[PDB]
Homo-oligomer: A and B are copies of this chain.
Amino acid sequence: KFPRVKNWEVGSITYDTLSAQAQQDGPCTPRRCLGSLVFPAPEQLLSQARDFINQYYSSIKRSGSQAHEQRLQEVEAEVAATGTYQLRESELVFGAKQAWRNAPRCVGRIQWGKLQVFDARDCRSAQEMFTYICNHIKYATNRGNLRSAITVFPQRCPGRGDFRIWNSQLVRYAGYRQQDGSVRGDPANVEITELCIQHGWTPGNGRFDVLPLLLQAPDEPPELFLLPPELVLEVPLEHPTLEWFAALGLRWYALPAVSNMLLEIGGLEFPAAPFSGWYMSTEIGTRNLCDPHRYNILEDVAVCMDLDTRTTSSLWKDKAAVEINVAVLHSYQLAKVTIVDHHAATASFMKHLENEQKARGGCPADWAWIVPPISGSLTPVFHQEMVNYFLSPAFRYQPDPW
């Protein structure tokens, strides 16, 4: 009845029984698989709330207690009287951690139980959002000894617009579109760059200009806030044996902080809830720096390495990409900023899968996202079959607010 899941390296087999509890539908059908696609009332709120409250009381081993029953009744009553309900602080903490644990595209989930949760549900203005965000960044960065964290802004509520952070991450480099169609800086950020400019930002003209934040309080247009440079820790990139590499003037920032996803807990929705961890080196060295549609540095690095770029069979692309990844790891370690390589990260994810099989009888995982973008089959996750499904609490994509 349950999907049989094999590891091909070791030959071990498990059944994913957790998948039977999937709470929402994905995009696949028996006729065709769409797994590779990036982006494919009171009664329902009450059912989701009860399920969540049940999750919480199981988690602390107090299922069936007087406390468990009291909370179920209180939530049902609150929904009946007000159309919604409020989480207790302990439930919010549990819910944020479960959403991380449930995230099928995250390879760093061995860390799921260690998350600092900042409660910003009393926030009242964009100015105050900025205060909460600056404190999050300071805490999470911790002078380079990075700590995972999430700040939760007020939930969606009838009669009131949402809190939103327009930027996709708290730290993003500007992308300035040029006349020929080319881009100076990060091509991923052309749209948000133009929005900042539309909203009164005086642009720079470098390749690594840190963008301001556009923060939206309910029923207000977004407001522009500049991050203090002392707050945004960055790492200049150099290579331990290719001395010219430093002359490329590349850098990246310490803190990956996703700020445009929706956090869903017990039927409640938090459209502003930025979360941060630390980088896996391939995100920077392979994707951000080597994607043709990002900084696209591969050929210039290969030429400086004096590789033969005239034919593909010399594997110049592969050689240059490996050395760029070496530079990222070396540079972050030199700067004493937490980073994890893809071998260490995937090994820890295998341990997570093992832990979760025992704890819950399975683990939702998106193979295409878990396997790293270089050296895929050299990592244990390549050889591991995975089952992808949606559990709640969850982090979800949402439409851009403009």
Contact = CB atoms under 8 A, between A and B. Distances in A.
A6 interface: yes
A322 B367 CA distance: 23
A33 B29 CA distance: 8
Interface in A2-50: 3, 5-6, 8-11, 16, 19-20, 22, 25-38
A341 B31 CA distance: 33
A59 interface: no
A291 interface: yes
A325 interface: yes
A293 interface: yes
Given A318-B374, A367-B368, A378-B317, A32 B8 contact: no
Given A34-B387, A36-B367, A318 B312 contact: no
Given A35-B28, A35-B367, A378 B3 contact: no
Contact of A371 (B16, B319, B376): B376
A279 to B, nearest CB: 13
Q: Which of A315, A326, A377 gathers the greatest number of chain B CB atoms within 10 Å?
A: A315
A355 interface: no
Given A373-B377, A375-B374, A378-B374, A30 B33 contact: no
B374 A32 contact: no
Contacts of A312: 341, 343-344, 347
A287 B377 contact: yes
A375 B317 contact: yes
A90 interface: no
A385 interface: yes
B33 A35 contact: yes
Interface in A254-293: 281, 286-287, 290-293
A325 to B, nearest CB: 6
Given A315-B341, A319-B322, A375-B317, A28 B29 contact: yes
Given A31-B389, A32-B388, A9 B292 contact: yes
Interface residues of A, number: 67
A321 interface: yes
A273 to B, nearest CB: 26
Contacts of A388: 32-33, 35-36
Interface in A133-178: none
A380 to B, nearest CB: 8
Interface in A341-365: 341, 343-344, 347
Contacts of A5: 37
A141 B344 CA distance: 42
Given A312-B344, A378-B374, A32 B36 contact: no
Interface in A381-398: 382-383, 385-389
Given A26-B32, A32-B389, 6 more contacts: A6-B37, A6-B38, A22-B32, A25-B30, A315-B329, A318-B378
10 contacts: A9-B291, A19-B31, A26-B33, A29-B29, A35-B367, A35-B388, A36-B388, A312-B344, A317-B375, A318-B322
Closest 4 CB pairs of A and B: A373-B377, A28-B28, A35-B35, A25-B30
